[PDB]
């Protein structure tokens, strides 16, 4: 329909009133903007002079009734925090916002038995009324027609969930910094979102009033600085910190050596001119890390300066302090996608939902007065359209994965424009994926730039146990990687200075023999370490604490490690080698920032020890190497060998799905327990690998020869244990299996004690294994191991927040928690006395 948009007329004898009436308002009553001119007929050339007095105040007053839903008042202080009225996120408004922007994410659709999320796009809507309010005051004096939105950034506060449907949001916003640039006046506005009291996310915006602004008294910069860590290792760093008068410790004689100092600083700057600062006052509490990681205030930055040209504090903490999460780029920036979006013919449907009723985007006449090439499409729409493609292609159709998103509006886009975005994954930041995008119009002219910080998908680490120890494993990384080199060097040096050999030698060339020589004052130290290693064994129902290396006394000049093929295949060099290769690999991923902060980790037996030191850094690499070497030696000395070094134990890789298609793991556990009872020879299930597919049963070498014979016989006879015990006869399968265990055990008790373990139809004999570890048999071997662990793992180096819900032991098969229920579960599985002290005295450790 044909509505009146302009009314040109006379207001007085000399005054003209070109009154631009826009119709798309909040209520529906069209809002009139009366811009004036002073018609002077005595100026024949230019008889029109535009009224400048009150011009910006009128323009603002119109835009108030367009955006703000309050009484018009500009005599408020910009410094003061602005608190926008709370807004409920409704399913209908999430439908209409997602329809306007063309966002096709399932998370924002009404689904069965599912919460509808709200896009972080939607946040700019709720904020808008507070954020825009920032640019209104009388001390931010500018024409709003010449408002350039430079950039807009969303940053999801760590440990928050993205916005859900029905979430009541309490919105604040404050001006970061209003600066008089040469080209105009940049206003940076940060809007916090507070749901349920707790902060969820911080929208950032950058508004650039174009023109000339000399009012530097109005200019300020209220920046909060990023936290900066300093590991104080050497006494020059202390002397430097004590020279810093600003660095005001609460206690003067606080020892700072071998600590970690965080500086939660903020920068306040007030200007004299565009280049110099009138007054700078950087202050904020100086925290120190405790061995508990709970940081304690021990002082304050209280820098107070006048005619400054910078922040010395920020400069100081920048070079001498790390930004916690360092960003590192990829080797080649991966081109993710090259997509082709499309701007709609009109922007009205987005303006209505976003409350962004700026005429210039919709009205032709305002756009003409604003010197624009037409009804320029909403930057916010271009921001939301690209982010929906970044959420589709990089986040992979997930909402929570998108955290950070900053977009700069390089050039304006006109309606009916086929844009072309280029998505590029360039870096990683503490596990997160940093993607840069550049969108171009049909002329290839840059219109959008920006970078989206995306959560890497939820990850679980599994560290392999004792598998294939191929010669020179992990050397490929050790040549290239520096993070791997550091680990390998420290380990190598520690073995040279503790056990008088080099792991690097043993991995690289795998010598058949290696002789430790205890020659000199270093030699004595090596022989003390090799002496102190002990192990406990049950002999005639008697726990004897025997000594590892019986042929190492006070007067032993050398020891010899002797293998047949290579010492790498020996457990005492297999276990550290493999654990170090895994630790070196993980340290390479962690240097390049490919480890998510919340990921789960759970290693398979030996791998577990790596995995603990990997994610949690509980033990030092000098502690890890000792505890994996000692473990390898204790395992090696557990069994009573002959002169050939051969034992009467071993393992088999049983497949319950081969013997039959009805043979479950409850059918296997019955057959193994009955075999163990009847013959009396030790046999247990030590590995539950994969359900009804992979198990490993250790124990006596004859008892695994009975198990192979029993599951060869039952496979041929085609009988099921579970069918006959339930629906045929009660307790008859017990005695009927004893006669099959007795006909296997007679033929298994006639071959000698170094009996070659023979492969059956379901089982495979795990060659090189001579000890039943993960069996009841090694309970006796735990107390010396436990004494060694408590010596090596100092309680000051353990942290709970890197274990609680993340570490999954193989003892329990339950995620690590510090509770009375889990402690009960650990005791039940392993009946120790220090777990009975903690369970009993639990009600004292609660305070």
């Amino acid at each position: 329909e044909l509505k009146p948009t302009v009314i040109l007329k006379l207001l007085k004898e000399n005054i003209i009133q070109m009154e631009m009436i826009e119709n798309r308002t909040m209520d529906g009553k069209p809002v009139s903007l009366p811009l004036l001119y002073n018609f002077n007929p005595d100026n024949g050339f230019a008889p029109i002079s535009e009224v400048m007095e009150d011009r910006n105040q009128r323009i603002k007053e119109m835009y108030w009734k367009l955006w703000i839903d309050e009484p018009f008042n500009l005599d408020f202080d910009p410094r003061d925090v602005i608190k926008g009225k709370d807004f409920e996120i409704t399913a209908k408004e999430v439908y209409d916002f997602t329809h306007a922007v063309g966002n096709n994410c399932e998370d924002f659709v009404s689904r069965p038995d599912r919460t509808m999320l709200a896009p972080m796009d939607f946040a700019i809507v709720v904020g808008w009324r507070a954020i825009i309010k920032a640019i209104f005051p009388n001390t931010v004096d500018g024409d709003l027609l010449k408002l350039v939105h430079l950039s807009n950034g969303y940053k999801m506060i760590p440990g928050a969930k993205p916005l859900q449907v029905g979430d009541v949001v309490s919105t604040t916003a404050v001006i970061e910094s209003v600066v008089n640039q040469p080209t105009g006046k940049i206003v940076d506005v940060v809007g916090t979102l507070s749901r349920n009291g707790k902060p969820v996310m911080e929208v950032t915006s950058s508004f650039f009033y174009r023109g000339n602004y000399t009012d530097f008294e109005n200019t300020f910069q209220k920046t909060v600085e990023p936290v900066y860590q300093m590991h104080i290792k050497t006494s020059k760093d202390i002397a430097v910190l004590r020279s810093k008068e600003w660095f005001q410790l609460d206690d003067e004689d606080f020892d700072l050596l071998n600590k970690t100092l965080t500086f939660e600083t903020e920068t306040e700057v007030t200007f004299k001119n565009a280049n110099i600062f009138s007054s700078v006052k950087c202050f904020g509490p100086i925290k120190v890390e405790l061995p508990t990681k709970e940081t304690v205030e021990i002082g304050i930055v209280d820098y107070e300066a006048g005619a400054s040209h910078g922040n010395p504090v920020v400069d100081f903490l920048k070079r001498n302090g790390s930004t916690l999460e360092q960003k590192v780029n990829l080797e080649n920036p991966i081109p993710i996608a090259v997509l082709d979006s499309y701007t709609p013919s009109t922007n009205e449907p987005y303006a209505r939902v976003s409350g962004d009723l700026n005429p210039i985007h919709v009205s032709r006449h305002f756009a003409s007065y604003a010197n624009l090439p037409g009804t320029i499409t909403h930057g916010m729409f271009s921001s939301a359209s690209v982010r929906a493609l970044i959420e589709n292609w990089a986040a992979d159709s997930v909402s929570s994965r998108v955290r950070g998103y900053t977009c700069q509006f390089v050039d304006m886009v006109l309606p009916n424009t086929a844009l072309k975005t280029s998505i590029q994954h360039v870096g990683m930041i503490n596990g997160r994926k940093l993607i840069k995008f550049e969108t171009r119009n049909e002329d290839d002219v840059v219109v959008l730039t920006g970078e989206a910080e995306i959560e890497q998908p939820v990850t679980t680490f599994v560290f392999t146990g004792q598998g294939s120890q191929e010669q020179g494993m992990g050397m490929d990384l050790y040549k290239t990687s520096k993070a791997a080199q550091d680990v390998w060097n420290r380990a190598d040096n520690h073995f040279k200075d503790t056990y008088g050999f080099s792991i690097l030698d043993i991995v690289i060339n795998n010598p058949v023999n290696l002789t430790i020589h205890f020659g000199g004052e270093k030699g004595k130290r090596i022989r003390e370490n090799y002496s102190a290693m002990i192990f406990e064994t049950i002999v005639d129902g008697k726990l004897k604490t025997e000594k590892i290396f019986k042929e190492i006394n006070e007067h032993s000049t050398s020891y010899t490690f002797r293998s047949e093929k290579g010492l790498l295949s020996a457990t005492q060099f297999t276990q550290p080698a493999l654990t170090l290769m895994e630790k070196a690999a993980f340290e390479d991923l962690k240097s390049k920032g490919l480890i998510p902060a919340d990921a789960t980790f759970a290693g398979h037996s030996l791998g577990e020890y790596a995995a603990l030191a990997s994610l949690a850094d509980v033990m030092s690499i000098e502690s890890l190497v000792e505890v994996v070497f000692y473990r390898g030696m204790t395992m090696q000395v557990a069994v009573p060998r002959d002169e050939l070094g051969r034992s009467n134990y071993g393992m088999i890789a049983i497949n319950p799905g081969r013997v039959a298609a009805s043979f479950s793991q409850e059918a296997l556990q019955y057959v193994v327990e009955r075999v163990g009872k009847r013959t009396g020879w030790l046999v247990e299930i030590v590995n539950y690998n994969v359900e009804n597919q992979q198990y490993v049963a250790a124990g006596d070498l004859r008892a695994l020869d009975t198990v192979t014979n029993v599951l060869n016989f039952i496979k041929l006879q085609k009988i099921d244990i579970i069918e006959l015990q339930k629906s045929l006869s009660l307790e008859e399968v017990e005695g009927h299996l004893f006669e099959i265990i007795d006909e296997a055990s007679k033929k298994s008790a006639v071959k000698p004690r170094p009996l070659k373990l023979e492969r059956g139809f379901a089982c495979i004999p795990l060659v090189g294994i001579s000890v039943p570890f993960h069996s009841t048999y090694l309970m006796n071997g735990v107390k010396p191991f436990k004494s060694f662990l408590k010596k090596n793992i100092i309680k000051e180096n353990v942290k709970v927040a890197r274990l609680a819900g993340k570490y999954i032991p193989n003892l329990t098969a339950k995620p690590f928690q510090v509770t009375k229920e889990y402690f009960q579960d650990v005791y039940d599985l392993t009946g120790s006395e220090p777990i009975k002290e903690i369970i009993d005295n639990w009600e004292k450790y609660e305070q």
């Binding site: 939820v458 560290f463 392999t464 603990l612 570890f773």
Partner: protein
């Protein structure tokens, strides 16, 4: 629970967990039925010299987690560090 007392109890717990771990069976099925279901983990990275754990984790998902993943509509990536190193480091060939 104070930070220092909790730290002591955690330190004593992990010590006793590592001390007895080689004296208890490796209940990995009741861990593969924790991080694949309870954590709903969609990326299983194996660090090692052979894809045993990634070849151990693709069998559990085939067996009992076809119906569970088809009812939630997630995609699970299974990777080994020895074999699938490129899709871990994000270093593909043109």
């Amino acid at each position: 629970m104070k930070p220092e007392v909790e730290q002591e109890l955690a330190h004593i717990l992990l010590t006793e967990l590592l001390a007895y771990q080689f004296a208890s069976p490796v209940r990995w099925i009741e861990t593969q039925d924790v991080f694949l279901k309870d954590f709903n983990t969609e990326r299983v990275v194996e660090i090692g010299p052979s894809p045993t754990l990634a070849g151990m984790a693709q069998r559990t998902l085939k067996n009992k987690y076809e119906s569970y993943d088809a009812a939630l509509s997630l995609h699970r990536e299974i990777l080994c560090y020895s074999k699938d190193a490129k899709e871990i480091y994000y270093t593909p060939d043109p």
